[PDB]
Design a protein around this ligand. Structure first.
Ligand SMILES: [Ca+2]
Ligand SMILES: [Zn+2]
Length: 391
């Protein structure tokens, strides 16, 4: 059978397999892709994931039973061997990487600095965001859901721009990427305006990635309300609402002005930025700490009670998920509430970091899915994720 011939080709070029989160993440890699680097990628995914949920405000799969219930990651040794993915898997290789939502799989390759301005972790983080968008943000499958029907390129600027943006995720924020900021034109006149960006499409080329990235960072830092409203329409599959929002935003001269001002500030601070990558804290061996002890410290740190903590197994370590709810005593509106929760969660992470156990340096956390209880109070789901112990 032809299928047997293909798998032998896969096993040849991608002999190594690494599994995380009880098999929910499977990384197939070439022999030359470093084991330590792959482990780092897992932790990188958690930083992006937590920031993504904070901003998107949903951590529930939009559709249960989809192939992205398991995330498969394919990493080739180098750019040259990546081209074989077309024959082996059947997908386009004219890119740094690609995510195929239908099979919950994203493909990429290790590279030296000479071959690309982006590191593997950087591209990994970008591609991971597509997986997050597919699973939690955009209903239906890529190119098939309602957001793609009709005008196929309607969400493209945001889908790619936010993917670039979320690649700068850290444990507490989303920070600018030197590689993306450097791509922005030094001449203000040459930069995209909002209207141009908001109607960009794949056939336009690759420039809108950088400007979409810049607009995302603008929204996050200076227009959280627009970011929030955009993701709400997406989650609701409200295509008309999104389109109305795009038209209003494109023709808003103040939005364009503030967007261009944000880019100037980004370009001005170029030397201050670095490539956000995962710290060495994730690889270090730590003293064993009890699950009950971790739960207790996190409950104290976050001021939540009756939390549920669950251990999960990966290939070379165990991790935990702590689930809790937090009730906001005063509802002061979406953005003010957002900032309160973001600051509160970050304060919790800092408190845990300041504790003696070095394991707390691996913790990522988010808040999501706000709702009103009886008595009109804002209840948030709260999730903390961290290393339990290396094997
Ligand atoms: Ca989807
Ligand atoms: Zn992309």
């Amino acid at each position: 059978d032809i299928n047997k011939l293909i798998e032998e080709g896969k096993k040849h070029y991608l002999p190594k397999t690494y599994t995380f989160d009880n098999g929910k993440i499977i990384i197939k890699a070439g022999d030359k892709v470093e084991e330590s680097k792959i482990q780092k990628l897992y932790w990188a995914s958690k930083e992006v994931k937590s920031q993504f949920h904070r901003i998107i405000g949903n951590d529930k799969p939009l559709e249960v039973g989809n192939a992205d219930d398991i995330l498969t990651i394919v990493i080739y040794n180098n750019p040259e061997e990546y081209k074989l993915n077309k024959t082996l898997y059947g997908y386009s290789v004219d890119n740094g990487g690609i995510y195929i939502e239908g099979i919950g799989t994203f493909f990429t390759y290790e590279r030296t600095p000479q071959e690309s301005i982006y590191s593997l972790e950087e591209l990994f983080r970008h591609e991971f965001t597509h997986y997050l968008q597919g699973r939690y943000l955009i209903p239906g499958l890529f190119n098939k859901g309602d957001f793609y029907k009709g005008n196929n390129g309607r969400i493209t600027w945001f889908e790619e721009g936010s993917a670039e943006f979320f690649a700068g995720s850290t444990r507490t924020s989303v920070l600018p990427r030197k590689s993306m900021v450097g791509g922005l034109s030094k001449n203000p006149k040459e930069r995209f305006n909002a209207d141009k960006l908001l109607h960009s499409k794949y056939s336009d080329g690759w420039d809108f990635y950088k400007y979409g990235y810049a607009f995302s960072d603008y929204m996050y830092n200076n227009n959280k309300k627009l970011f929030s409203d955009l993701v709400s329409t997406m989650k609701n599959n409200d295509v008309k609402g999104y389109e109305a929002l795009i038209e209003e935003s494109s023709k808003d001269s103040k939005i364009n002005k503030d967007y261009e001002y944000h880019m100037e500030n980004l370009v001005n601070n170029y030397d201050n930025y670095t490539i956000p990558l995962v710290s060495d804290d994730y690889m270090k061996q730590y003293d064993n700490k009890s699950l009950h002890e971790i739960k207790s410290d996190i409950e104290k740190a976050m001021d939540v009670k009756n939390s549920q903590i669950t251990k999960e197994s990966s290939q070379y370590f165990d991790t935990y998920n702590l689930k809790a709810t937090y009730t906001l005593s005063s509802n002061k509106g979406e953005i003010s509430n957002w900032n309160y929760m973001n600051n509160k969660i970050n304060e919790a992470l800092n408190k845990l970091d300041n504790l003696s156990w070095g394991g707390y340096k691996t913790v990522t956390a988010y808040f999501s899915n706000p709702r009103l209880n009886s008595n009109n109070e804002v209840v948030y789901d709260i999730v903390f994720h961290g290393l339990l112990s290396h094997n």
